[PDB]
Design an enzyme around this catalytic site. Sequence first.
Site, PDB file in Angstrom:
ATOM      1  N   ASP A  68       0.821  -1.209   0.000  1.00  0.00           N
ATOM      2  CA  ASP A  68       0.000   0.000   0.000  1.00  0.00           C
ATOM      3  C   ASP A  68       0.858   1.264   0.000  1.00  0.00           C
ATOM      4  O   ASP A  68       1.341   1.691   1.054  1.00  0.00           O
ATOM      5  CB  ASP A  68      -0.924  -0.015   1.229  1.00  0.00           C
ATOM      6  CG  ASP A  68      -1.832   1.190   1.298  1.00  0.00           C
ATOM      7  OD1 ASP A  68      -1.886   1.952   0.312  1.00  0.00           O
ATOM      8  OD2 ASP A  68      -2.503   1.367   2.341  1.00  0.00           O
ATOM      9  N   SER A  78      -0.508  15.678 -11.886  1.00  0.00           N
ATOM     10  CA  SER A  78      -0.763  15.314 -13.271  1.00  0.00           C
ATOM     11  C   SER A  78      -0.988  16.572 -14.100  1.00  0.00           C
ATOM     12  O   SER A  78      -1.515  17.566 -13.605  1.00  0.00           O
ATOM     13  CB  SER A  78      -1.971  14.376 -13.370  1.00  0.00           C
ATOM     14  OG  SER A  78      -2.310  14.121 -14.726  1.00  0.00           O
TER      15      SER A  78
END
Length: 330
Positions: A35, A199
Amino acid sequence: STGSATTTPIDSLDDAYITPVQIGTPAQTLNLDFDTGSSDLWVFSSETTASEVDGQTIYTPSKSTTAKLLSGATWSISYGDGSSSSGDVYTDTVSVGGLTVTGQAVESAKKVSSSFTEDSTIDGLLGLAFSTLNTVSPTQQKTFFDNAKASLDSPVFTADLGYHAPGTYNFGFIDTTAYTGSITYTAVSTKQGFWEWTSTGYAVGSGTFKSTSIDGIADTGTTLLYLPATVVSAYWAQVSGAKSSSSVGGYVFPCSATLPSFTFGVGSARIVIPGDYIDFGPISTGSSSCFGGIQSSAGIGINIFGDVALKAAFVVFNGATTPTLGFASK
Ligand SMILES: c1ccc2[nH]c([C@H]3CCNC3)nc2c1
């Protein structure tokens, strides 16, 4: 040193991925959920409330000659999805794919929430976010990666998740045969303890690319792709019959639909998520309504590049003094 381990989807929907991990002496092999959005290594154990264990493999520290109770240490964690767990702490030898860390904090669960009990295939979590998020009190503990880093050939690990197929976590090296083209690296903020990056934009299907900054985290422990409501609306508007369902808890779409791809930007580079990756199947058995793999982050407080996005890429988690993230097509 290096390590290399295969990671395997737990079910036909790629709801999560499990990776075998050796703990203790002699080894006890548990299948953990790696994770990159949390920083605790915790396991089902001989200490877990009996009624909360249902098919998981447990760690029994009393059978490990290298286990030591970390005196006075406790842990307690809650993830963004409503799930939680807590317990006490041992140190022990932990190996992943041939890479060994001695004195790793292994957090033994006394309590786990129902969603963990119900996943018989997941024996615990191995956190790979930054150690500042680790919940052990009163002395915060280091992640497996943090402990291994100085010994690794290169201070990196990579995630290569498969679509409906096994994949690979590598530690300490970049497998140049595992991706196409070049790896594009992008800046990371560790201010919130995550692999947080920005992004450069997105496209829906064959549509034009929208240049826009989207701050989010690279999180292998989250199944879906969670993005701003504007972006998610733009995606599902291209799917006839798709709608947000408050009763189901997100966007659903007719199972007869053909889903468009979704592209996200990494600098000047582009990662394309095929439409099929965004299908998470009937909302209940036999239903013709299917659950979408792109969902709004509005109620979360952060955008999450989860498995739906990450499994479309070869992803480098670069733990150099100034950490960065790399993405390549594959
Ligand atoms: C749905 C809602 C909230 C969520 N929070 C998370 C991650 C973020 C970092 N660790 C947990 N996944 C979620 C999925």
